[PDB]
Amino acid sequence: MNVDLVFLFDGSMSLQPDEFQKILDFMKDVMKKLSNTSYQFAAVQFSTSYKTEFDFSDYVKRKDPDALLKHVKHMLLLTNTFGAINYVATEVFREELGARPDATKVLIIITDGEATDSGNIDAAKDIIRYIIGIGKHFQTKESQETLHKFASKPASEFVKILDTFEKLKDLFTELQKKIY
């Protein structure tokens, strides 16, 4: 349907270069698949700070995932996930930046660890929120639970755990199908 979807992706120092690249490729795969639909996309990299890599209006103008992401630079700092989610809620979903009043808001968060900051994400709560937690830091039920606070309910649907960044490929294949 009419979906305004934002990727919020981790660019902290704990991600290896190849891992950060797998994230970019995942986002391109998704966008390529949903070309020529009612989907609109935006992407934000977060680390210590929050960098909008492209807004919805950027997407409407070009609709080319390669061009939209070509200058992305890995920030290699902290993992301020609380600040990042609030940033998306208030700074990215705006009509002035191409967001649509009647579109469903979706936020896809991709990270390798726990947030380095703190607070709440009240402002983003109405958004449909998936979080993809990847790698060695999420190998136990207890470590995986730390992500639930960022996601819609139930966690069994909205929190995805991958053992490696190579599994983003497999996740895309699975997601591809859910497309009606």
At 27, list the tokens. Answer: 């986002």
Indicate the residue among 23 and 115 with the shorter CB distance to ligand BJZ. 23
**Number of residues engaging ligand BJZ in binding (CB under 6 A):** 15
Binding of ligand BJZ by 132 (CB under 6 A): yes
In whole angstroms, the minimum distance from the beta carbon of 5 to ligand BJZ comes to 6
- Footprint on residues 77-106 left by ligand BJZ (CB under 6 A): 104, 106
Supply angle C-alpha 128, 65, 116, rounded to 5: 50
Indicate the residue among 30 and 72 with the shorter CB distance to ligand BJZ. 30
Tell me the C-alpha distance between 3 and 175, whole Å: 16
Tell me the C-alpha distance between 11 and 78, whole Å: 8
In whole angstroms, the minimum distance from the beta carbon of 130 to ligand BJZ comes to 4
Indicate the residue among 74 and 160 with the shorter CB distance to ligand BJZ. 160
Indicate the residue among 77 and 167 with the shorter CB distance to ligand BJZ. 167
Residue 91 near residue 56, CB atoms below 8 Å: no
Instruction: Report which DSSP code applies to 114.
Output: -
Helix (H) or strand (E) holding 154: none
Residue 41 near residue 55, CB atoms below 8 Å: no
List Cβ neighbours of 29 (8 Å cut-off, separation of 6 or more): 172
Binding of ligand BJZ by 30 (CB under 6 A): yes
Supply angle C-alpha 55, 84, 159, rounded to 5: 100
Binding of ligand BJZ by 22 (CB under 6 A): no
- Footprint on residues 101-130 left by ligand BJZ (CB under 6 A): 104, 106, 108, 128, 130
- Footprint on residues 152-171 left by ligand BJZ (CB under 6 A): 160
Interacting residues toward ligand BJZ by CB under 6 A: 1, 3, 30, 33, 104, 106, 108, 128, 130, 132, 160, 175-176, 178-179
